[PDB]
């Protein structure tokens, strides 16, 4: 014979609990990647982005190593 249902209350805050939030952790990860890719794409034109980030990527990085010949540069 059972006298009482068997349960506990999990910690919660603002209607969130750890079981639920843990399911969404991967999703935040992917959104972070999306935001990262997007942000980087938006500043791909910025010379510093090319110099410090994009030109350092192996193989692909030579896409962003471009020199104007001294003969063609007024400045």
């Amino acid at each position: 014979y059972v006298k009482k249902p068997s349960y506990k209350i999990v910690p919660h805050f603002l209607g969130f609990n750890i079981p639920t939030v843990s399911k969404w952790i991967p999703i935040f990860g992917i959104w972070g990647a999306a935001a990262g890719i997007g942000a980087l794409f938006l500043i791909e034109g910025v010379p510093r982005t090319r110099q410090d980030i994009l030109s350092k990527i192996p193989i692909i990085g030579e896409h962003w190593i471009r020199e104007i010949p001294a003969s063609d540069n007024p400045f």
């Binding site: 992917i30 959104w31 999306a34 890719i37 997007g38 794409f41 896409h63």
Partner: peptide, 23 residues
């Protein structure tokens, strides 16, 4: 299936498109 993944894929593809189309 996941919109997070779909948007990430679209943005990565846009990056690739932009670079290859330019060339």
């Amino acid at each position: 299936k996941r919109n997070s993944a779909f948007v990430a894929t679209i943005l990565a593809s846009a990056f690739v498109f932009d670079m290859t189309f330019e060339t």
